[PDB]
Write a protein that binds this ligand. Structure first.
Ligand SMILES: CCCCCCCCCCCCCC(=O)CSCCNC(=O)CCNC(=O)[C@H](O)C(C)(C)COP(=O)(O)OP(=O)(O)OC[C@H]1O[C@@H](n2cnc3c(N)ncnc32)[C@H](O)[C@@H]1OP(=O)(O)O
Ligand SMILES: CN(C)Cc1n[nH]c2ccc(-c3ccc(F)cc3OCCn3ccnc3)cc12
Ligand SMILES: [Cl-]
Ligand SMILES: [Mg+2]
Length: 385
């Protein structure tokens, strides 16, 4: 890899290594007044488009572009299929900017062929809290790959973020770029074993017959934490306290306001699931996971893999293993086929006992214009959608 684009950016070179005493921008003393006011140039016949994610039709356009052209697994069997309602939630968090939801249309067809987005968040990296943009949903149509459109989308969003006097960003990708601050493998816990085998995701052998595989992943339909229930509006303060305190141990986490807790955690069917255990009107334990189905490509029987992805989980009245067991059960009660988690926070400690299998790859965490020491994923305390 030459990384001809990335090496022009304020990010580490492949060989850069910083000790814990270093925790600062690559480029400081930036000036809003100096930021370019002109949009980056696109190739002839393409135009910028400002997407209105609150408009059902504009939102449907983004949904279509992602459904057809977003992230596939390494074998091109599954493609992420974020729902339209999920994209509304993900992009309209507190203080979002409509001008950070950027499309590219092909003028002659009037169709969206590219997208990139950011939302603002306070990010604590090695105990320093910085206002950052969280970048997500970069996508170029399959038919226009390897034409250098992605650097155009990246430079244009950078410019729009810089106009708001924001100079750092956080992003994640499965691909290796200069240069990860942390790298987390993903693990999967089978729920609907038979389906996962039939679609090729899971395997049998002469020892592990179909019936034996089903038995292995069987779970008791009783919670360890009996009062675990869907989160309600009244629980916002308590979730804010519980989670906000928990996250301070990590090397990388978002500093959530109360308004951010209500947005990111209050339940929305088929989008975000949060459960809480209330004692004495105080929230003592919480479970959360989001819904990210994948379209199954080329399977006669099934079109969709329903997948729950571990989000934020905190226990003070049980063991972490007991809490994540309940999280798997609650995913099962909600019709999910598989429960997915990264080896961030305390997650790795429960993978063997709760019968997770190692996946085929990892998610890399990145910062833009920030130099600092890298760290094991157990010290990562943030999950991006
Ligand atoms: C202060 C504010 C700062 C704000 C900005 C922060 C940074 C935000 C950064 C964005 C974070 C988004 C996070 C996110 O959304 C979650 S990661 C998911 C990204 N989306 C997909 O994987 C969807 C399917 N793939 C595509 O749509 C295309 O393959 C994409 C658009 C990925 C690249 O289109 P393409 O047609 O395949 O490629 P060219 O146009 O020819 O471009 C080639 C250049 O793109 C570099 N590249 C490829 N994949 C990347 C990736 N995932 N991040 C960053 N850079 C990526 C690549 O290394 C090369 O640069 P190089 O020559 O130096 O190696
Ligand atoms: C994070 N958010 C930015 C979306 C995103 N983009 N890129 C990714 C690469 C992996 C995961 C992921 C995260 C947790 C997990 F349990 C399974 C995952 O992927 C399986 C499918 N796969 C394989 C290779 N590429 C995709 C998410 C993402
Ligand atoms: Cl340029
Ligand atoms: Mg391109």
């Amino acid at each position: 890899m030459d990384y001809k684009f990335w090496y022009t950016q304020p990010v580490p070179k492949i060989n850069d290594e910083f000790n814990e005493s270093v925790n600062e921008p690559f480029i400081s003393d930036n000036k809003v007044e100096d930021v370019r006011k002109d949009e980056y140039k696109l190739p002839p016949g393409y135009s910028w488009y400002v997407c209105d994610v609150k408009d059902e039709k504009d939102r449907s356009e983004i949904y279509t572009l992602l459904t057809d052209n977003y992230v596939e697994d390494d074998d091109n069997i599954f493609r992420f299929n974020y729902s339209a309602e999920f994209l509304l939630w993900a992009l309209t968090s507190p203080n979002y900017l409509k001008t950070w939801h950027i499309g590219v249309k092909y003028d002659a067809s009037n169709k969206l062929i590219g997208f990139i987005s950011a939302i603002p968040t306070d990010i604590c990296i090695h105990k320093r809290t910085i206002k950052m943009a969280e970048v997500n949903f970069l996508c170029v149509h399959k038919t226009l790959r390897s034409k250098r459109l992605a650097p155009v989308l990246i430079k244009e969003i950078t410019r729009r973020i810089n106009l708001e006097n924001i100079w750092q960003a956080i992003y994640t990708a499965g691909v290796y770029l200069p240069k990860p601050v942390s790298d987390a493998r993903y693990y999967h816990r089978s729920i609907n074993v038979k389906k996962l085998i039939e679609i090729g995701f899971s395997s049998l052998n002469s020892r592990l017959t179909m019936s034996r595989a089903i038995k292995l992943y069987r779970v008791e339909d009783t919670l360890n934490i009996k009062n675990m229930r869907l989160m309600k509006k009244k629980d916002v303060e308590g979730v804010h306290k519980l989670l906000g305190s928990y996250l301070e141990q990590f090397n990388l986490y978002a500093v959530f306001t109360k308004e951010e807790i209500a947005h990111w955690f209050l339940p929305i069917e088929n989008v975000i699931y949060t459960y809480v255990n209330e004692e004495n009107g105080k929230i003592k334990d919480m479970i959360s996971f989001y819904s990210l189905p994948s379209q199954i490509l080329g399977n006669d029987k099934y079109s969709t893999l329903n997948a729950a992805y571990s989000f934020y989980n905190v226990t003070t009245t049980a063991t972490f293993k007991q809490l994540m067991q309940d999280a798997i059960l609650l995913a099962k009660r909600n019709n999910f086929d598989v429960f997915n988690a990264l080896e961030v926070m305390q997650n790795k400690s429960v993978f063997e006992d709760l019968k997770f299998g190692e996946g085929d790859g990892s998610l890399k965490y990145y910062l833009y214009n920030w130099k600092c020491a890298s760290f094991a994923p157990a010290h990562v305390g943030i999950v991006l959608l």
